[PDB]
């Protein structure tokens with residue numbers, strides 16, 4: 001869709017803790033319920049020495065907040081990773097300063113998130129998020145407060 | 156919250172057909188499911204000679220798309236109406252050109268909609284909607300395509 005990627009991305013520097021501060025998707029049903037397919041809350045990024053990205057996340061599964069670990073395998077493009085699915089899906093990093101915020105989208109139909117390092121509404125990062133979204137066909141946008149950010153599955 | 160109201164509002168001129176093109180709310184759960192409390196789709200406005208506003212809407216009730224009629228009673232302020240509830244709730248008209256778009260919010264916790272006259276994504280009206288929202292503490296925003304606009308309960 002989806003032509004904002006980060007130049008010069010250093011994947012090692014996105015390691016560590018993240019909070020899904022805001023989420024957006026092209027279909028309401030991708031994000032509408034707690035158990036909706038793309039309602040996933042990022043907990044931690046672990047880039048591997050190969051330069052694959054391991055993702056720890058929470059997803060509300062059947063009546064509970066399950067912890068999931070997913071591998072995004074690297075591509076020829078440093079800002080684009082691949083997740084193995086049914087068929088499968090690209091993760092693109094649009095923008096990050098490493099230390100405060102990271103924007104990314106998953107496509108294939110589309111969902112994007114604004115990730116932040118701390119449980120804080122980051123006005124700057126949310127501006128960047130909305131700007132990157134105005135380019136995209138989004139029909140639902142969610143945002144979470146600092147209290148929900150400290151809760152499992154933002155409950 | 157909620158300090159954008161329309162000056163010189165002529166309530167007779169909002170009569171007729173409307174489409175809820177976009178919705179936003181301060182709590183995700185006010186809009187998340189089809190049966191969520193403020194997921195209501197405006198069908199028609201009928202101002203009465205007294206200057207009360209009769210509202211025809213659809214709401215997804217128990218497994219189906221119910222038609223509801225609600226009366227918003229006028230106040231001293233032309234752009235502000237009152238709905239009788241458990242306790243009760245103000246409707247404010249923020250902005251309208253009568254002929255294309257109308258923005259309104261309901262408060263008491265808060266939901267706003269961008270209404271349009273035709274089943275068309277109105278880029279102008281959506282700009283106005285987002286501008287009026289940046290002032291407000293919104294955590295979910297929904298938008299509907301022209302196909303869903305022609306469907307009962309936007310299904």
Ligand SMILES: CCCCCCCCCCCC(=O)O
Pocket residue numbers: 014038040042053055057059068070083091093102104106
């Ligand atoms: C910088 C990469 C950000 C992490 C991308 C998250 C991808 C999650 C894909 C969701 C699939 C699933 O959980 O079933």
Ligand SMILES: CCCCCCCCCCCC(=O)O
Pocket residue numbers: 169193195197208210212214223225238246248257259261
């Ligand atoms: C210009 C006025 C726009 C109409 C305002 C809609 C108010 C709907 C309130 C929802 C309450 C309910 O349906 O139970």
Ligand SMILES: [Cl-]
Pocket residue numbers: 027028029
């Ligand atoms: Cl939908």
Ligand SMILES: [Cl-]
Pocket residue numbers: 182183184
């Ligand atoms: Cl919530």
